[PDB]
Amino acid sequence: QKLIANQFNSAIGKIQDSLSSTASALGKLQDVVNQNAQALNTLVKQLSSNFGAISSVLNDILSRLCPPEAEVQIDRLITGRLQSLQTYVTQQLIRAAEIRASANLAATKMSECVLGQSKRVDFCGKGYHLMSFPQSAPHGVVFLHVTYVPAQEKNFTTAPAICHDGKAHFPREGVFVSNGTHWFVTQRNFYEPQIITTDNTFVSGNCDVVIGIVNNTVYDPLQPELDS
Amino acid sequence: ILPVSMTKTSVDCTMYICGDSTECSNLLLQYGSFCTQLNRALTGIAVEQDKNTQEVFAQVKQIYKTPPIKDFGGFNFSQILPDPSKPSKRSFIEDLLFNKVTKFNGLTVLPPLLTDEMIAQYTSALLAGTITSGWTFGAGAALQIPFAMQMAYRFNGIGVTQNVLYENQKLIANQFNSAIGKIQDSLSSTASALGKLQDVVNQNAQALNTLVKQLSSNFGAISSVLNDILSRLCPPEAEVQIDRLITGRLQSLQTYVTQQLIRAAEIRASANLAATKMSECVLGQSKRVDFCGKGYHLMSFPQSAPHGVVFLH
Amino acid sequence: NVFQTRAGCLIGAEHVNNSYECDIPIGAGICASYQTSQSIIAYTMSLGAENSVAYSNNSIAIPTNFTISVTTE
C-alpha cells in the first residue's frame, strides 16, 4: 500500500511538472479556440471585399450614387456578404458536430472512467484502468487516468494442467508455473507463487486428453489432518 | 470491414476558377478570402485522413514479430500473418482485400503519410503481439504466453471453464483453421463484401468528377471556356461575362468542399469506431455484445485494406 | 540535397539513411526534421522499436512488480 500510494503521489507530481513546463500539451483545446478565432476573423475580413462593387464600403456607394444604380452596387455586396455568412454558419455547424462527438465521448469517459471502472482496453488510458479523476479546462475536460502497468517480467516454464494420480488438475484462478524444479500456481497479472493444492485447482477427467500436461504432486490439505 | 480514411485532395481554387487567366485572377481577388478558406478546409480534411489512419493502426508501441517456429497449439495463422514472398509483406488475406477494392484543372491527390507497406507492418505487429502475448502488449510489455493457454484465458473470459478448451483443443484449432479458410473462399468470390470501402472510393470519385464537369457549364456567360470570352471580348464586357463564370465555379467549389467536410466527419466517425475496435477487440477481449462480431468474442485480428481496416472477429 | 520522394521532388532537405519518429510529415513514408552546422534532414519515418517476443509452447512471462501510471487525456 505504501509503494502504490508513493507511485500515485509521484505520478501526480509528474502531471504538475509536465503541465507547468509544456504548454503544447493542451493543443486540442487551444486549437478549438484558434479555429473559432480564425473563423470570426475571416468573417470580419470578408467585409473588406468588393464582390465586384465600386467599393467595399456601403457608405461610398450611398454617398456617390443615387438609387437606380446604387441598388445594383449594394446587391453585389449583399450577395457576397450573405455568401460569407452562409459559409461561416455551414462551417460552424460542421465544427459544432465535431465538438458534440467530442463532448459525447467526454460524457462517456465521465460515466465509465470516473463514475466506474472501465474494462474497455485503452478507453481510460494505457494499462489496466484503476480509476480516473476529472479536471476542468477552458472549453474542455481533462481526465487523469490512473492505471496499473505490469512492470518487471520473469520468464517461467508453464503448463495448461497438472497430472496427479491419473486426474488432470487445472487452476481455479491463474496459471501453473515453475522456477525450474518446483511447480506453483499464481494469479496471471502478478507473481505470487502458491503450492499447487486441491483448493487452488479443479479436476476434469484423466491425463490423456490435454496437450502439454505435466506430472506433479497436488497437495490435499485434508490428508495431513487425517495423518494427524 | 470499416472505412478509416479517404483520398486526400487539394484543389488549387485559383487554377480551378481561372485556369491561369490573370484577367480572371484579378477579378477573383475581389471575392477576398473565399479561395484561402477553401484551401484551409481541404487541408484540414487531408491532415485528418492521416490522423484517422494513425489512430487506428499506430496503437501498437513496438513492431512485434512472430518467432520462426509457428508452434501455436494447432491454430494456423499463415493466411493472416505476413507473406515473405512479396515486396510489400501483406498477408494472404490482405492481398485479397487489396485486390477487391479498385484533373489538370487544379484538382490533385496527395499521398497518405503511411504507405500500404507501413500499414501492413502495423497490422503485422498488432497481429504478432496478439498471437504471442494475448492482451498483455496493450497493457504494457508483451508478456509471452503459449497460444493454447491464451485461448484458455479467452474461454474463461466468456464464462466457459478452461478445461473445455484443453479437452477440445484439436476441435477448436480445426474449427478456427476451417473458418479462416472460409474467409479466403468468401473474399476469392464475393466482390460485394468490400462494398463499404468501395463506396467511399465511389463517392469521392463522383464528387471530383462532378467538380470537373461543372467547368463545362456557362452559368449564364456567352461561353463556358474562359479563353473564348478573353479572345472575343474586351474589359468592360469581358469582366461581366467572367464574373458569371467566377460566381458559378466558386459556388461549385463551395458545394464540393462543404460535402467533403460532411463526408470527412462520416469517415472520422468510422475511424474512431475502427480505432475503438482495434483497442477493445484486438488489444483486449470485449464483453460488449455484438461489438466484436456475433457470438461471445474470443479475439480479433486486424487486416489492412485500401482506405480501411478489416477485423476478423 | 535534391531528393525524389513519392510525394514529389524535395529540394534543400538532406536525405538521411537513419529513421526517426515523424517530425514534419512530407508523405508516402517520408518526414523531415531539423537536426545537427544544422540542416533540415529528410528520412523514412520509424514505426517503432522492433521486438521479437520470446514465445514458445511452454514459456510464460509474469510481472513480479507493477507501476501505477497517471496519464492525461
Curated annotation (Swiss-Prot), chain A:
Glycans are attached at residues 155, 179, 215. Changing residue 62 to F: In strain: Omicron/BA.1. Residues 1-51 are annotated as: Heptad repeat 1. Disulfide bonds join 113-124, 163-207. Subunit of the fusion protein that is processed upon entry into the host cell. Mediates fusion of the virion and cellular membranes by functioning as a class I viral fusion protein. Contains a viral fusion peptide that is unmasked after S2 cleavage. This cleavage can occur at the cell membrane by host TMPRSS2 or during endocytosis by host CSTL. In either case, this triggers an extensive and irreversible conformational change that leads to fusion of the viral envelope with the cellular cytoplasmic membrane, releasing viral genomic RNA into the host cell cytoplasm. Changing residue 108 to I: In strain: Gamma/P.1. Residues 30-74 form a coiled coil. Changing residue 182 to Y: In strain: Theta/P.3. This is Spike protein S2'.
